[PDB]
Design a protein around this nucleic acid. Sequence first.
RNA 1: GAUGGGGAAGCUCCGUUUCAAAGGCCUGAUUUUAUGCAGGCCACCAUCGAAAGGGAAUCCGGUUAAGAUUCCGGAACCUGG
RNA 2: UUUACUUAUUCAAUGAAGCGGAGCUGGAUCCACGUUCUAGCAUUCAAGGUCCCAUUCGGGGCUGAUCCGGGUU
Lengths: 97, 77, 91, 112, 135, 16, 29
Amino acid sequence: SINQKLALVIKSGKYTLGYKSTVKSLRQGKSKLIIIAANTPVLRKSELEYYAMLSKTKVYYFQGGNNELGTAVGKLFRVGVVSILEAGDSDILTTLA
Amino acid sequence: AREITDIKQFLELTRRADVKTATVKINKKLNKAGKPFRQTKFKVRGSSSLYTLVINDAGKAKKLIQSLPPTLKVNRL
Amino acid sequence: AKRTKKVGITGKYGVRYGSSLRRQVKKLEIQQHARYDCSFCGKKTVKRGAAGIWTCSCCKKTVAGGAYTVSTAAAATVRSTIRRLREMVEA
Amino acid sequence: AQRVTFRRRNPYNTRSNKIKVVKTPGGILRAQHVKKLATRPKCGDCGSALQGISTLRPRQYATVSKTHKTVSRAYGGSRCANCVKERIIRAFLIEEQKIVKKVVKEQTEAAK
Amino acid sequence: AKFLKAGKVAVVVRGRYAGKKVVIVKPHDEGSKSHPFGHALVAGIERYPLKVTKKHGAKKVAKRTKIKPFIKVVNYNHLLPTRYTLDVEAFKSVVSTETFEQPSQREEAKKVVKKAFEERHQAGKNQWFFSKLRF
Amino acid sequence: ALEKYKERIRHLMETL
Amino acid sequence: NPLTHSTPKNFGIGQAVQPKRNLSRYVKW
RNA sequence: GAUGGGGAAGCUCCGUUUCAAAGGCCUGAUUUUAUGCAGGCCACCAUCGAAAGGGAAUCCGGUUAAGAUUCCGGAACCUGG
RNA sequence: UUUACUUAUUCAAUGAAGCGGAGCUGGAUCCACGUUCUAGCAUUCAAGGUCCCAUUCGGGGCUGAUCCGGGUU
Ligand SMILES: [Mg+2]
Ligand SMILES: [Mg+2]
Ligand SMILES: [Mg+2]
Ligand SMILES: [Mg+2]
Ligand SMILES: [Mg+2]
Ligand SMILES: [Zn+2]
Ligand SMILES: [Zn+2]
């Protein structure tokens, strides 16, 4: 599942959590996929989508809020957006997600 | 009331058109709780505000008194 | 260390008004003073300002709701019914 | 031990009749009437106090310069920096989305 | 990959020039001793030209087509990049790290930028760049 | 001078 | 004329402010 | 609590913006018919009602038989031009 | 008697602003395909298009914005 792929990325790949680090990765071109929580405000989501369009980065819309996204990435805190910097062990980039 | 610290500004204030009167006041004070010394306050009476220049040097104060304009009405002590 | 065996928040009323009325008031007072999750920012920071008005301390979002709870069962049923009708109209 | 009196003919403790006790150069205590304190101006979008704006009674704002009542930014004064930033972002993104939607609608009309 | 290259048009979101459109003349990803952060040397428009119609005469059009530029070093977090591009070959030499340090080579740099922007606007290029953002 | 400026602007329109 | 542009106005519902029109039929005489 | 209106034999009553043509501003050498004002714009209601509500700005020292943040001396501030 | 009509009379609202009919108007009897991810913005006889002027700082006409009605809704 998508949660299993995220857990595999957490245990094997490179990732960053949070809007500011995600934007820095997008600006530097190091990002490869961004997961956006469902309760993210629409202006924030639009800015992330515009940055992803500029940097040619894939966008996935997580079915769940920031609490669920934090649980899925294995943290005890809420996360609004997750940027995957390197996922070679996981198949998340090559799949539909 | 305003306090001035620039000597050129004080001279310009003394030569200002609306200025007619000045006052020279002498105080006996203590510097760093030591020996007595003499402090001189020059007060120029403007139309809106009164300007005060404070000088702690007796010789410089005497020189400034000599350098005051002659048409200015000076009230000593 | 529980200080009261059963009255709870209704200990401020003492021995007055009757026990059944005190229980009835206790349930709704716990509901109205509880803290609720914000549907926008995802935090448990929503409290009642006045009856029917629920504000989130973070993100400053104000939602209309029930007198002593954020969402009533009737409102949830109305929401589901309106969603079904809208889906039928679009389809 | 020195007791004081109101200096005006209002004998009641109203919001406009507040006093403080001050010692004069004459060596005596005397009442001194205090004006009501000013309220900081608020943002028009979020309601927070505006940074860099002087806090005065509304008539007193006519006596100060434009520096004390503004900041050097668009909506300086009336709105705060974060709200101005958010509305700039919203304006740009919505205009871009409008262009995108118009192009998509024209393509859909052509294909339909 | 990277989109914050020379010639990229961005919108300033913080500072005195907030809400105004600039073009990146020189990016700096690694910062410097001064401004120890990713930043960009940009040239933008402080005062946008007014709209002109068919009925306006030569003097009125000349008055309404005036452009006041500015040059700025700005943090990346204070810029919102766009998808538009603008040629920076005409003022690439005058906007540099040493331009800002010396008072006042900024005046000569802004004269060059003003002349380039006014000539391009009279030519009619970059309508979105020369259009004021309404917010 | 005005004619020369118009010619320069037209040339910039062509070449830009 | 490169300086002039066509900016049509949308006078539909929920759009730009309605222009002046002859309301002689609706005059309260 | 008047006016516009509407009741009442009537002294007067209702009502307070309606049910009213309820008043201000801009431009003009208006293609000239020759000494006659043309083209436009914006709109809602009198007045009374607080010496404790709201509100521009002043203090110190001295002075009288009895005045005093008001007079006198000194030093300020507001409003309008 | 039954069934209609509006013009007296009655009720309500408004900024008396979009009512009724028709379009060799368009798309498919119905619609305006001018507005629905977003706490932005929308105002100076409206820009543009086209006929003139006497070109000169600009000024007029049609259109943009279909027509008709002897009923403000
Ligand atoms: Mg009456
Ligand atoms: Mg009165
Ligand atoms: Mg009072
Ligand atoms: Mg007395
Ligand atoms: Mg006096
Ligand atoms: Zn919240
Ligand atoms: Zn704000």
